[model samples]
Target: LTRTQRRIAVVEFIFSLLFFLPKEAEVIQADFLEYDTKERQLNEWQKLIVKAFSENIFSFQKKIEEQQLKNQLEIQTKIDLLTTAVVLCALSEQKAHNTDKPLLISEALLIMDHYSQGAEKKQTHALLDKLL
Candidate 1:
């Protein structure tokens, strides 16, 4: 893998580690575990695709419709966002010393400000609302 890919892999693993909450019933660990398992499965599938293509034995262009491919990509994107958000929330809560409730509040406001400026924003506020 390239350096960029390695960096992304590290980031994914770190986020996975952070996001995993074993004690919280609201943020169930099982769901994140399942998501991680599925993500790893998808990674394996992509690796197989690359290996097949390297040997001139496979072509996705011929097998997948444009819309289907787009839908799959979208699903993956959502998974990534949800996982990242869960991880970030876990991190924030872990770091928030009870004395620093305002710190959490500020971090949340900054996140909201940043997301508000982005195109195609998901309902991140709703997720935060539930978590907070």
Candidate 2:
């Protein structure tokens, strides 16, 4: 596979690491102390990433409707944003699993900012290198 394809695979794996709480209620008046009753709110970074993906897909679809060829840079930018999102989600998942608590929006954004500044590429490369 090509380098980009390999990177995509790694990103997919990272994406799988995230697990969001369900929006459904299994019980009426559930005990707050006995169950994982974390609020069903998306973190700031998650919201940003979701918006980025939506915009990117919409732009791509618009280009297709216009019969324009895809731009390589635009595609790459989307991939990079997805990678950033995956990394951020993976970190948040780890934090939540390790602490047995919900990940804070401030913490998630802080981690996302850190990874956006090229740290994620390094981690992604290392992970791909190990797996491949």
Candidate 3:
């Protein structure tokens, strides 16, 4: 992966890490994040993404639901929640980093694919249009 992709991966992981809220979540997150390199670093921009949303997680969660976005897989599943959170984080990353919308959306879809079977581009695109 390119440097930007790696950063996105780490940032996305951190965003999800904030919401994981389960026992051993951080331990598992650490294992997955840097098993190979033994270290994962964040640039100033990605760190800011974590800082901004981490401080305002409830507001961040409400923002996606407020959008009332459809085709979000299913309205009531862990997969849906994960996808929404990760995609919303991607949008936040775009605004903070000036990364392109389409690029972030693509990254989000692929990232969620590991955790889910379906991804929604149409709703995701509309989300970026509204927020960014």
Which candidate number has the best TM-score?
3
User: Candidates ranked by TM-score, best first?
Assistant: 3, 1, 2
Query: What's each prediction's TM-score?
Result: 0.25, 0.20, 0.57
The backbone clash count of each candidate, in order, is 0, 0, 0
Which of the two, 2 or 3, has more lDDT? 3
Quote the lDDT for 52 in model 2: 34
With candidate 1 superimposed using the best TM-score fit, by how many Å does residue 19's alpha carbon deviate from the native? 19
Q: What shift in Å separates residue 17 of candidate 1 from its native position after superposition? A: 19
Name model 1 segments beyond 4 Å from true: 1-27, 37-99, 117-132
Clash pairs of candidate 1?
A: none
Tens digits of lDDT, candidate 1, 1-132 = 442232233234334544443233223323333444433543443233222222321122222223233443434323344334422442333232222344434444444444453322332223232232
Q: What is the C-alpha local distance difference test score of each model? A: 0.34, 0.33, 0.55
- lDDT string for model 2 (1-132, tens) is 332232233334334422332212222113211322243222333333333333343333343333322322445323444444444343333332332122323343344454465433223222211121
Q: lDDT of candidate 2 vs native?
A: 0.33
lDDT per residue as tens, model 3, 8-51? 56545654564554325345434443533424453555555554
